[model samples]
Structure formats: structure tokens, C-alpha cells
Target: AEISGAGASFIYPLVSKWSADYNAATGNKVNYQSIGSGGGIAQIKAGTVDFGSTDKPLDSAELQQAGLGQFPSAIGGVVPVVNLEGIAPGKLRLTGALLGDIFLGKVTMWNDAAIVAANPGVTLPATKINLVHRSDGSGTTFNFSNYLSKVSPEWKSKVGEGTSVQWPGGVGGKGNEGVASYVQQIKGSIGYVELAYALQNKMPYTSLQNAAGQWIEPNAESFAAAAASADWANARDFNLVITNAPGEKAWPITATNFMLMHKQPKDAARSKATLDFFKWALENGQAQASELHYVPLPPELVKQIEAYWGSEF
Candidate 1:
């Protein structure tokens, strides 16, 4: 049997891992396309795929309207990666406000006073700072802009968050992979991508100041801290953002990736098979998720998710 889904390049690396590993361990195969979340939502709504994956959860209202079921399947951090000549990964730090300023195109130079103030004693050049952003409609962009909106009033009013936004000024890359590649190719450039992509490409990233006023690096533990206080059972529609979360060790840009399905599947047998696949994955895939620096859903939350499936599907 084969199950198919499409969505969220942010979740692609992990899903690809799950697909390959799942097939190796069982007869069933899973085929997923690394299309953006907009594409996934459209396909699932059109009944073209069995399910969808996304970092951007549909709101309660949206889900109810669409008659779709949504739940978080994984957690991870989105990081600001840079291609500066001398600074190493984790060496430079950025506050949410400063990050917002940069993406807002207000801070154009690498050695801007705001950036220097945040990273004391670190010598920054005066090179024109290039911003790389997603061109496609993307959940990563959704989460990234969501964080920006939370931190900057200017950002909220001028550039709101969603799967797609009118970028102020920057080079546009088609996907996370494309954005990562552009950042690597451009000097004095910064871009945001899932932590796995940053790690995989060996890109240098900035430590972001959290809501608790402490700068933190991105890692499994840091991502875990941001998610620590989430009342998963209580979050309506699983629509929640962990960015700028209050915790000493929390990575400010953490986000939950979700799976979307129809409340009443068109094909019940395939839905059952899909449910079984997820159940198996929840039990067996944590190590793989952790290896990729994605925080697996908590065991209690996993139980809750199973219950959600039972009630919904």
C-alpha cells in the first residue's frame, strides 16, 4: 500500500527520513512531495493527497470551515543563518527587535549600531547586508513572519505574517533549500531556515535573544525549552506559536510542524492506513527526529494526539 502527502518544505527533511525508514521496516510505502504549505493545503482540500504536512497550522476557524483535522506532529527551531566572512556560528547574537529591523530593511548594513550593540566586542563590517527570503508560499515563511509580527509593531503593521508576504527588500528564493543556497552564495547575507537545513549546510547562525531576556543557541534542548510550557491539550486547533517564548534556555523561533487530514476521509481504508503509519511513526521515529535536531512530540502529547485521531478520524 502507498500513502501520499504534500506540504511544508520545513518538514520535508524529516518526512523524507520517515518515509525511507518506514518503508525499510514495513511493506507499505509513503510518497510525499516537498511542495510548500499552500500547495499542500490546496491539494488536500482538493482531495488529491491522503494527508498534508505543514509548519503553519490552520486556525480553529479555518479548520472548522474547511472541515479539516490538524495536529502537531513535530517541533523544531527556525534559525537565522548568515554568510559573514569571520563570525562563526553562534558567535553573533540578535534580539527579536533587531532581527525584525533587519528583515524590515531598516538596518541595511552589517555593522549597524543595533547589531553591534547586541553583539558587543564582535567586529562587524560595513558591507551591505543582503536579506534572503522565500519566494514561494511557505509555512517556514509563515512561522518566520509570525515571529516578526510578534516582535515588531512596524512589522505587524507594515508586513504581516502568513504563508506569503510582500517582502520589503531582499532576494527571493523558492524554498528553504533555495534560501539556504542563496545565503551560501551571497556574501554578507542572512536567511531563515529550519535548524536541520542550517546544520546540514554547515551555515553560520546567530543566537537569538529569547522572551526571557537571555540569548540562546538552537539545539534539541533549547527547542524543547520553548515548547515546555505549551498546554498542548488545550491549544485550540493546535494553532500555536512558540517564538519569543519565555524560558531561560528556549530558542525564540521554535515552531510546531503539523499533519492535516480530512475530518471524514474520502477513503476510510487509506485513512486507517495513514493513522497506523503515524502511530508507528510516533512510536519509532523520535530518535530520527532528534538526530535531525527536531524535538519529538512529548509522550503525553503523543497520547493526546492518538486520542485526537480516535475522536476525529
Candidate 2:
């Protein structure tokens, strides 16, 4: 595995531990480099890794370039994680626009009126915020930036969508796992990680205002809601954006993890192995996703993915 990434730190353990077990069980070495999203894309484009993974889906133009095909693995939510003393987990709530302001460098503290307005009874810290973010090309960056681009025109214009964005604030880490560790260690630090990861680390996550103006928490119920709205039959690009999921209680920040691979294998054996491993992860390892706060693939999507299992082999 020359190319791999966990857009959020939470997916790191899932992929990492699985790699270890896969190697031991089959003796086929799976080398996953947690190089963040950008590196994964680059490595894939450069033909370094056999496969690449990301939280953000590839845009249309990218599909033909690498002769790539994509399919969903586990789905998850990306939530804002921060270290604010005295404010308990899930105590902090924020809206898309307000979150944009924070990343835009306008909202500098936990107690900013913008943040406080969303949480009436929540008293937050007064420390200077240390915004930790990915320093590499990352699908997390794409997802987060997509949210900002949707809510703020300035952010949209200044920073167009891509795996790597020119962020205005915060310290940068190499991968999602790196950024998560940074937030955990630094008091008053803030960054966004996948829901399961934040929950796993017992880190604080802010509630996001949904399309219906309801503050929703990321969970199985909400993730399922988002998945229900997916147009799986027509999702040719794998651009699984859940910003406008139809469910009334759906969390707006939910997205899916994607695997990038060659549609027609240059090496038939390697290609078969690649698809086989994914099937193994799906049929065998799918149940494990929920333990990490990830939503497993729906049966329908699973069939679609399997249709491509040996398509060009």
C-alpha cells in the first residue's frame, strides 16, 4: 500500500490495526502511509501506492486522469473538536457560518459571541485558541473546506476546493492522527476530527446546525439519515456530499471514506488482491466500523461496489 490516508484521525486506527491483522492473516504486506489526504492523492497520481483513501470524494475531472474507480467503505461525520476548559464534551455548539468564521481567523476564542450565541447556557474558556489542522494534502481539508465554501462566499472565493487548501490559521500536522494528538496535548487547541475518533479519544465535539436549523449530533441515527438521501444509483463520481441530506434530524457534517484504484488493472493479480482486500474489509470487517463511530455500507452500495470487484480483471 503505497498510498493511504485517514482524513480524520479517527479512521487511522481502523486502517492501521486492520493492516496489521491483514498482513498476519494473509501475509500480504499492506503498507499504509498516514501521509494525510494530499500526499495520498499525490502518491496515487504518481503511481506509488496500489490504492489511496480519503474522506473527501474526488471531483469529476480527476476520474479520467488516473483511470481511477472509487467505492465507499465506512461513512462518518467530521465534527469540530476543541480543548476548552470547563466546557464539557458536546457542550459547545456552532453553525456552519460561525465555524467558517473561526477558521477564517475571525472567531479567536471559545467565548466569542458568535459561539456563545449558539450555546446559551454554555460558559466557555477565555484562552487564545490554538487551531490545529492538517499540514498535508488531506480529504479532511477538502470536506472542511467544502463546508466553509458553502457557508461563506469569501472563503469560497479565496480558497477554492481541493485536497490541499491554503488555510489562514492554526498549526499544521502531517495526518489526521497527528492533528488529533496535537489537539489532545495542547490546551485551548481546536481542530476537527471524525466523530468516532473524537468520541474514541473522549475529545470535545461541537454540535453543528443542520439544514433545518437544528443542532444535530453525529451518530448511527443521523448517519443513516444522511445515507438515505444518497443517490447511490447515480453517484458516478463518488462525490458523496451530505450537506443537504433530506432527513430532518440528519447531521450536516457527515461524509464518506473512498478508495481509489485502477479500473483496469495493470497487474491482474495485484488488482484482484486489491479488490479482494476491500471485499474482505466489507463483508468481514464492516461490523467493526460501528465500534469506531463509522456507519457501515448499506447493502445496496455493497452490491454496487461488488459489481466492480472483477470488472476489468
Candidate 3:
């Protein structure tokens, strides 16, 4: 059976791995288009794909309206990557408020007072900061903007959360890879991407202040720490957001990537195969997920998700 899925470059690396391994083991093919979440949602709603992947979960009302069943696939962090000379990964520290100002173009210079105040002895550059953001409808943008909205009142009032938002200023990249390339090529540029992209590109990423007011680096442990606070038991359709979670080691921009399928799939056999693929990945792909810096769902949550499969299918 060939399964078709689309959406979310945030989860592409892991999905690619799972698909490859699943193909090898089960002789089942999974074809996934690493389009942005908005495209994925559109395709699924249009009945063009077997499943849609998104980091931004649809609300219960939205899911009900679309006749879709949603569940989380994996947990990961959205890290702020930079192309600054002499600054290594996790060396630059940023508060969510300061990050909002940067993307808003309010703080254009690298050595702004707010930035300099955070780094005491580090040499600050006077270079103008260039911003790189997703041009596509992206769940990465949603989570990033969601975090900024929580910390920055001005951002909340001006540009709230969405898969795509009107950027105050910045060059737009198409996907996580595109943003990473843009940041790599442009000096003094900063962009947010899934932790895997940043690490793979060896791009310098910033340490962010968590809800606990402690500076945290994006990693599997920190991402899992943030995810630990999610009340999945009470969440309807697993539509829960875990950004800016409260914990000493929690990453501020942690997110769970999700899969969306129709309540009644047009192709039942393919749909069953799709669900089986995810179940196999959930049960057997945790180590690969951790190697890519994504946190696998807890066993308890997996059990609940299995129950969802039973009831929804």
C-alpha cells in the first residue's frame, strides 16, 4: 500500500526516516510532501491526501468542522538560528520580548541595549540584523509567533499567531531548509527552524529564556521538559499547545507535530495502513527520533493515542 501525507517541514526529517524504515520492514510505501502546514490542512480537507502533518494542532471546533481526527506525532523545539561570526551555538542569549522586537524590526542593530544587557562580556557587534522568516504557511511560524505573543504585548496586539502572518520586516524563505540556507548565506541574519535543521547545518543558535526565567538551549531533554506539562488526558483530540512551558530546563518554543486524517477516510484500507505506519513509528522509532533531537511521545500518551485510533477508525 502507498500512503500519501503532506505538511510540516518541522517533522520532515523524522517522517522521512520512519517512511524509509517502514518501507524496508513492511514493504509499504509512504509518500510525504514536506509542504507547509497550511497546505497540508488544505490537502487533507480537500481529500487529496491520506494524512496531513502540522505542528499547530487544530482546535476541537475546527477539527469537528473539518471532520478530521488529529493526534500528535512527535515533540520538537523551534530554535532561533543565526549567522553571526564568532558566535557559536547557544552562546547568544535572547529573551522572548527581545526576539519579538528583532522580528518586528524595532531592534535593528545587533548591539542594541536589550541584547547587550543580556550578554555581559561577549563582544557585541554593531551590524544591522537581518531577519529570515518562512514565506510559506508554516506551523513553525505559528509556534514562534505564539511564543512571542505570550511574552510581547505589542506583538500580541499587532501580529498574533497563525501559520502565516504579516511580517513587520524580513526576507521570506519557503521551508525550514530554505530558512536555514538564507540564514547561512546572509550575515547577521536570524531565523527560526526545527532544532534538527540548525544542528544539521551547524548554524549558530541562541539560548532562550524559558517561562521559568532560566536560559535554556534547544535539545531533546529541554523539548521533553516543556512537553511534560501538556495535559493530554484532558485535551480534546490532543489539541494542546505546550509553548513557553514552565520548567527550569524547558525550552520556550517546544512544539508537538501532529497528523490529521479524516474521521471517515475515503480509502479505508490506505487509511488503516497510514494509522499502522504511525503506530509502528510510535512504538519502534523512538530511538531514531531521539537521535534527531525530537522527543518521542510517552508510553501513556501512546496508549491513549491507540485508543483514539480504535474509537475514531
Which number leads on lDDT?
A: 3
lDDT string, candidate 1, 1-313, tens digits: 9999998888888888988899889988989998888888988888999998888888889888888999887898899999998788888999998999999999999889889888888888889999999998888899889999988999999999999999899999978899999999999999999999999998998999888899799999999999998878788767887777787998988998889999998799999888877887788899989999999888998988898998887
lDDT (CA) for every model shown? Answer: 0.89, 0.73, 0.94
Question: Model 2, poorest ten-residue lDDT window?
Answer: 1-10
Q: Model 1 lDDT vs. the true structure?
A: 0.89
Give the count of colliding residue pairs in each prediction. Answer: 0, 5, 0
Ranking by lDDT: 3, 1, 2
TM-score of every prediction relative to native: 0.97, 0.89, 0.98
Q: Write the per-residue lDDT of candidate 2 for residues 238-294, one digit (tens) a residue.
A: 666765465578877777878777777566676677776778778767667766667
RMSD in angstroms between candidate 1 and the native structure over all alpha carbons: 1.2
Model 1, runs deviating above 4 Å: none
* Best model number under TM-score: 3
In terms of lDDT, model 3 sits at 0.94
RMSD of each: 1.2, 2.7, 0.9
Give the runs in model 3 whose Cα sits over 4 Å from its true position.
Answer: none
